[PDB]
Specification:
Length: 63
C-alpha cells in the first residue's frame, strides 16, 4: 500500500524520492509520477545505482 519513497496525494499524483546519507544527508526528488507503481519503479532504479550491489527497493527485482 505505502511504497517507501513514494508520497501519494489526495488528487492522483505521486512523488518518487530517496534518502542519500552519502551526500551529507541530502534529499533526491526523482520526480512526481501518475501512480504509485510508476513512482515506485523509478525509486528502485535510483536506489540501485546509488546503493550499488543489492538494495532494499519497493520492488526487489529478482526474476
Amino acid at each position: 500500500k505505502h511504497y517507501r519513497g513514494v508520497r501519494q496525494r489526495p488528487w492522483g499524483k505521486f512523488a518518487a524520492e530517496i534518502r542519500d546519507p552519502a551526500k551529507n544527508g541530502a534529499r533526491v526528488w526523482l520526480g512526481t509520477f501518475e501512480t504509485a507503481e510508476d513512482a515506485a519503479l523509478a525509486y528502485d532504479r535510483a536506489a540501485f545505482r546509488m546503493r550499488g550491489s543489492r538494495a532494499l527497493l519497493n520492488f526487489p527485482l529478482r526474476v
